Amino acid sequence: SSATPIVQFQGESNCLKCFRYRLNDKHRHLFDLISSTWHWASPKAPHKHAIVTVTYHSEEQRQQFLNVVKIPPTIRHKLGFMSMHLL
Amino acid sequence: SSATPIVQFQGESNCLKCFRYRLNDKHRHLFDLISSTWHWASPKAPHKHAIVTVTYHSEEQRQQFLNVVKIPPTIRHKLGFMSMHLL
Numbered sequence: 001s002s003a004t005p006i007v008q009f010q011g012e013s014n015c016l017k018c019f020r021y022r023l024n025d026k027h028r029h030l031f032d033l034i035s036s037t038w039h040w041a042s043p044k045a046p047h048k049h050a051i052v053t054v055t056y057h058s059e060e061q062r063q064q065f066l067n068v069v070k071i072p073p074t075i076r077h078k079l080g081f082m083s084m085h086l087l
Numbered sequence: 088s089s090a091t092p093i094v095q096f097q098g099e100s101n102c103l104k105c106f107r108y109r110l111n112d113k114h115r116h117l118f119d120l121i122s123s124t125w126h127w128a129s130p131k132a133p134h135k136h137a138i139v140t141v142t143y144h145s146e147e148q149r150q151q152f153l154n155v156v157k158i159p160p161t162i163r164h165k166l167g168f169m170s171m172h173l174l
Contacts, residue, residue, distance in 0.1 A: 012108065017101035018161065074109075 003081040005062045006055050011075040013037050013050035019075055020052050030065040032057050033087065049076070055087065090168040091119075092143045094152070100124045100137035102161040107139060110156070117152040119144050120174065136163075142174065 009016060016037055023034060035053040040046060056062040062079070071077055096103055103124050110121065122140040127133065143149040149166070158164055 012105070014101045014108070015105035018099065018105045021099055021101065022161070 010049040097136040098162040
């Protein structure tokens with residue numbers, strides 16, 4: 001509706017980029033969009049890890065992704081939402 | 088000995104870079120030198136993977152490395168030697 005379900009992955013950039021490659025290789029059907037690697041700039045930031053945002057068509061698809069995909073321990077993930085208007 | 092034991096790792100470069108940092112953080116004293124990622128240039132190349140070279144002080148250290156380190160699934164490895172002179 002007004003909100004798109006997302007998972008944000010956080011970690012060191014190369015490990016994250018490796019993970020992104022893996023998702024694109026094997027799990028393209030379990031998510032919608034996936035971003036390039038990014039971070040929060042400047043010392044005014046919540047953390048300084050690299051970040052990849054992955055979006056889903058629905059909360060069901062996000063849950064199916066989380067049930068299937070093995071997230072490496074060195075990559076943290078957080079669920080949330082962003083305005084669908086932003087895509 | 089005039090030959091240095093090596094392990095060559097092959098895969099997607101961000102995966103190899105992630106692996107390299109993991110090696111340096113958790114297994115630094117089970118290998119000697121570690122290269123940057125490289126590949127074979129031009130159309131003649133035997134493959135198109137990126138590559139990392141890891142050297143060892145001795146065959147005993149290499150075996151201990153292989154006994155202990157869990158090599159991630161994006162990455163293939165081969166064992167061999169290179170002239171010590173080249174280091």
